[PDB]
Amino acid sequence: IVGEALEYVNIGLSHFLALPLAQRISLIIIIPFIYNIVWQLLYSLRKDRPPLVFYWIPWVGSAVVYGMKPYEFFEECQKKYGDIFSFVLLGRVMTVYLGPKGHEFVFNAKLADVSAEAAYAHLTTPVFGKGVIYDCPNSRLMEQKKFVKGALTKEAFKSYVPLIAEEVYKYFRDSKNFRLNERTTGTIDVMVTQPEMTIFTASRSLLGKEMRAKLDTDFAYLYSDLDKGFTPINFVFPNLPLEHYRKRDHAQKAISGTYMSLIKERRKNNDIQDRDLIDSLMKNSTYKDGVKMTDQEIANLLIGVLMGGQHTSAATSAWILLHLAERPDVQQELYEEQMRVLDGGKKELTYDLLQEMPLLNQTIKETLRMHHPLHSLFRKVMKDMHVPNTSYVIPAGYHVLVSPGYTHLRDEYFPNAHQFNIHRWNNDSASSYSVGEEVDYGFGAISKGVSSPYLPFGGGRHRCIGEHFAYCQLGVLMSIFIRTLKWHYPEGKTVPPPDFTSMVTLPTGPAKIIWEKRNPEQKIGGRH
Ligand code: HEM
Ligand SMILES: O[C@@](Cn1cnnn1)(c1ccc(F)cc1F)C(F)(F)c1ccc(-c2ccc(OC(F)(F)F)cc2)cn1
């Protein structure tokens, strides 16, 4: 008789349901925690799965450790388990593939194996709007990137350079952080100054003078609100009945409206030229199946590209200034190059002259190596993936995580990886370099191999299309900083650690530098 025993199963369940509320609430915690521990131990005998990082708290997983310092988490995991390992993150299973073969396994994954929009849609769509980037099929994204890249040409960069330089000189003249006509030395926070310079220069060149002029009004409040909405909290809390979210949503509606007003006002007056990205998106924003982007999708794609280039470029800027601020030898070297290429300052900065400043371009290159703005890129795995040369299978529903920024800081690929050395790039000062065969996913010919250990702009179909614009912008910025100012740290200060819980790996604030004018009596002309 085990019928007697199955009777006691029923009896035992009734006694459980009659336990005090003190013991049942403690059991609604103990039973998940123990089953979590038993499951992991049985999962560790699966030979068709990467090793899984142990963790106590269910659902949360390695969240805290990974979120606070992810490169140190990866290196500990890499020493324990090798280059392929999985870890649980706020409900998901993330399979990291570290190193250049992980660049290949993720960035070059078949379109049917992995989805970037499935990983990112809740991150970006609430900020940018609907129908663009990750709120549309991949084929739509590929052509959207063709549209934007069609405004990012050599000829456009030759007109952006004097526009960007004008904004920098105006910032030095008019901003309270400088006032170079009035002050010859001062202290700035680079996390204050660089996001401002970045949007001022990005607005003026990409969006035009009307949109730039709007940031001198109360309208700048809306960019701030929108900017605050650009956060990784959206991964788990995209829309909450909270106040930050309404200012964010209001700002998205208000900013896309301004852009549409200009779009419809320029099409009504047929004022459609070749000035800015707006004119280009107006002239060239029809998919190859003949559907035209709407005015609203055009404005949402403007917010996406402006927001993305905003955070990457302003963090990089801030990092270039923070590193140079303890390197007066590099400032000095960079300044000699300015004097040589620009005839002691008697030549006007041009896009062409920027391409003859290899040390300045190497400084950007070296900063992006040490401070890759994106420490982790995700795809959601759609179909079961076999990891080559292993017995590993990554089942559907997993995420794959690739981290070229980790590889940038490994000694085995960059000698003395943790030293800032622009001369590691002597005779290799180009933003990036397709080391062979190319391929086109819809937005131009890019590198087919993505095995490079330096991948600041990723690779494959989801590869950045902003790299030439960002060099142009940073190039002009830094060329004017160098020529105008020396700068250094307050006493006993140094490079800050990155913020990895943020949207980009920007420096922990406040990060102050002291500036002094090279020519205290030089004045900046124009009215204010
Ligand atoms: C220092 C500056 C920048 C860096 C290091 C950078 C880095 C990256 C990386 C790593 C990716 C790949 C993301 C992924 O694989 O999930 C990417 C994609 C992209 N970036 Fe950038 N970015 C920068 C600035 C910009 C700028 C200035 C623009 C446009 C003006 C831009 C537009 C884009 C676009 C459209 C994509 C495509 C994403 C996709 O296809 O899913 N970025 N960028
Ligand atoms: O790729 C971006 C940024 N980007 C690139 N180029 N310019 N901007 C982008 C792409 C196309 C655009 F049109 C605009 C745009 F902005 C992005 F999609 F948003 C993006 C994707 C992922 C993350 C990320 C942040 C934190 C993370 O870490 C932890 F721990 F999870 F929080 C992990 C991942 C940040 N940004």
Numbering used by the authors: 7 to 534
Question: Anything the authors wrote about it?
Answer:
In this study, we report the X-ray crystal structure of VT-1129 (quilseconazole) in complex with S. cerevisiae CYP51 (ScCYP51) as a surrogate to understand the molecular basis of CpCYP51 susceptibility to tetrazoles. As we are currently unable to obtain diffracting crystals of CpCYP51-6×His, we have used instead ScCYP51-6×His as a surrogate to investigate the binding of azole drugs. The structure includes the full protein sequence from isoleucine 7 (I7) to the first histidine of the C-terminal hexa-histidine tag, most of the N-terminal membrane-associated helix, the transmembrane domain and the catalytic domain, including the fungus-specific loop. Strong electron density within the active site allowed modelling of VT-1129. The ligand occupied the sixth axial (distal) coordination site with the heme iron via either the N-3 or N-4 atom of the tetrazole ring, at a distance of 2.1 Å. There are 20 residues within 4 Å of VT-1129. Unexpectedly, the water mediating the hydrogen bond network previously seen between the heme ring C propionate carboxyl (RCC), the Y140 residue and the tertiary hydroxyl group in VT-1161 or the triazoles FLC or VCZ was not observed in the complex with VT-1129, although there is some evidence of density at the position of the water. In the absence of water, the Y140 hydroxyl forms a short hydrogen bond only with the heme RCC. The tail of VT-1129 lies in the substrate entry channel. However, our studies with full-length ScCYP51 show that neither VT-1161 nor VT-1129 are likely to form hydrogen bonds with the homologous residue H381.
The fungal cytochrome P450 lanosterol 14α-demethylase (CYP51) is required for the biosynthesis of fungal-specific ergosterol and is the target of azole antifungal drugs. The azoles target the cytochrome P450 enzyme lanosterol 14α-demethylase (CYP51), a key enzyme in the ergosterol biosynthetic pathway. The tetrazole antifungals are a new generation of azoles designed to overcome the toxicity and drug interactions present in imidazole and triazoles. The CYP51 LBP comprises a heme at the base of the active site, a substrate entry channel and a putative product exit channel.
